[model samples]
Target: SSNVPADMINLRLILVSGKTKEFLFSPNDSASDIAKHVYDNWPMDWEEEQVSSPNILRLIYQGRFLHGNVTLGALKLPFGKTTVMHLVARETLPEPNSQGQRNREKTGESNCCVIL
Candidate 1:
């Protein structure tokens, strides 16, 4: 089944910055689909509200944003192999007793960071 394209996956990226956030669609599935999966299963206390602009996203193979005519292979992703992508978000910690200070507290931690 690897030879055939898979179903389209819906994804959302949340970027936090001073109580503001934005969401954007991915350029193409090959370039961002895996990243979408990762975000969907992120093991952290992330919500849709606490994000900023330039959100990360992934689209279906040969989807829009490339004139809807490009192919996934053009992105140079290794077929059937695990790959990694990096997304960055910024959050500001206000002074204690401030209105937004409570949201800055670290609720919990997880061992999601890969050693490799």
Candidate 2:
């Protein structure tokens, strides 16, 4: 009943979403490598819209920011079918061509002051 590859682990790669994007990985793989790969591809897989979004998320598990230098196994995370991991906002960017106007309207917040 246990004949799976020892070097490979099942990984659930997600972006702050309760969606299915499970993948396979090597225990020796660096977290940075995995994160970069996900970041490079996930935006393209978006379900409803076509976008080339910026790499604005950080890989996290249990709400802790995962470092790129650490090995997956070294992190001692539970990796399997029921395990979950996600990406979160590293920073915020204004909506496409909104000039922060929409953001300002929504939040009443700004790092810039309009001098008129």
Candidate 3:
């Protein structure tokens, strides 16, 4: 519809490397129906168990962190569903590092969200 911009309707995937603090933004051409698109062109093997953290799946809208580890399902706005962007993310994960831990302190809690 005219309300929904073609660029905004599709899902955008971003990957962050904790070890290197590197952020990768997928090209518009890589947009896909599957979530795996984020790792499609990865140079290394995709480790879901090690990399599947909300902190790594930050969702940014207009340069703001709208949500992380979440997917956009539908949107509700004063105008209509198509007028807004819908997003959802998995619950936060627990921190592996505790207080005063180098790993925990370096990453900063703001960068990590733990579920359960």
Q: Which candidate is the best by lDDT?
A: 2
Query: What is candidate 1's lDDT per residue for 22-110, written digit by digit as tens?
Result: 22323354333333234443222222224432232323322333321222445444444322233332241122123332243465754
| Best first by lDDT, ranked | 2, 3, 1
Tens digit per residue, CA lDDT, model 2, 1-77 = 13335556666667544444656776676544454455444222221112543344345766787653456677674
TM-score of each: 0.24, 0.45, 0.27
Model 2 stretches with alpha carbons more than 4 Å out: 1-4, 17-20, 39-57, 77-82, 89-116
Residue 67 lDDT, candidate 2, scale 0-100? 53
TM-score of 2: 0.45
Q: What TM-score does structure 1 among the candidates reach? A: 0.24
Error of 3 at 68 (Å): 1.3
Deviation (Å) of 15 in candidate 2: 1.3
Model-by-model lDDT, in order? 0.31, 0.50, 0.32
Q: Lowest-scoring 10 consecutive residues by lDDT in candidate 1?
A: 13-22
lDDT of 3 by residue, 12-32 (tens): 344332111112222232211
Q: What is the C-alpha RMSD of each candidate to the true structure, in Å?
A: 15.4, 13.4, 15.1
